[PDB]
Amino acid sequence: STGSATTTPIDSLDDAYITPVQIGTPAQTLNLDFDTGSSDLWVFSSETTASEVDGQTIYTPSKSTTAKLLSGATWSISYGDGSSSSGDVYTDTVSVGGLTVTGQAVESAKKVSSSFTEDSTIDGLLGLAFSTLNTVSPTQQKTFFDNAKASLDSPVFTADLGYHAPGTYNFGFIDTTAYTGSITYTAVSTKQGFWEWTSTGYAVGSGTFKSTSIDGIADTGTTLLYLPATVVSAYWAQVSGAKSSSSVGGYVFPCSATLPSFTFGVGSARIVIPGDYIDFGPISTGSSSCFGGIQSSAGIGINIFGDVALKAAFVVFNGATTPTLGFASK
């Protein structure tokens, strides 16, 4: 089997991407944030505290003839941005782009933190990291990809995120028309539960490539590119007037600037992020200070190849017995 679904930016900045997902019988379509940095499929629901729902579409398990309570199971998750959610668990039929999994754990939110409430466009998350990170207790549950894998034509999914435009998540096949050149594959460590890999270095603009190992994670659920402070300082030093602002919480730059590109290495290959992809717009409405798309990871504990980096590439998440990642230009 295969599946193919379009993913759409939630706003004019590409802050996140939503993909329609069919849950239950008859289908209830919710727009989920596909997140290769976490491993829980959770939704706003008829069980979510009413004051914490503000415009989201909700899953109502009592209206699904295939929903079953997973008795005794609870979940609770905290994300790197400080947001969180928790609740109980149903199993139900879940389909993405024509690919159907029966018996998928659908984590129903009883509580969500303010950032989820405040984002009316995201009805939940669909985790695509390794199932060892799933938070369901006392019986850990499998991701949608883990459940679908055996049925897929090939045990892979691909992320093709757009810049200010829709893109595609494919399951079970590699669309050879969606990228240019060849795909370069690179080793993955699953020891932390992430799609963790080592970039071979970087360049700023037209500058020379610096060969240096940068361990980080491919994370579709993180907006920006978070890299070591040395790398980030070298980038912003090329932008007149750019500075790190403690009050804003990262590097800012004059909105009048033209940003240089940023290149990262994948083995001997190179992925170029155009300068425009690094512009996240005014820090507040009407400001002439703009927020940078490359930020320091020094306070995180891990480097994160988020959407800023991934949307410059066609990315293969290869879930073979020994997982690997593939990157191609597009």
For residue 189, the 8-state DSSP code is: B
d(CA 295, CA 288): 19
d(CA 290, CA 152): 43
For residue 5, the 8-state DSSP code is: E
Examine the residue annotation and report whether 146 is marked as an active-site residue of this protein.
no
Examine the residue annotation and report whether 123 is marked as an active-site residue of this protein.
no
Residues in Cβ contact with 98 at an 8 Å cutoff, skipping those fewer than 6 apart = 2, 3, 4
> Given 14, 35, 146, 307, which residue is catalytic?
35
> Given 85, 199, 296, 297, which residue is catalytic?
199
Measured CA distances, 147 to 139, 142, 239 (Å): 15, 6, 46
d(CA 277, CA 164): 9
Cis before 138 (ω within 30): yes
Type of residue found at 154: S
Annotated catalytic residues are 35, 199
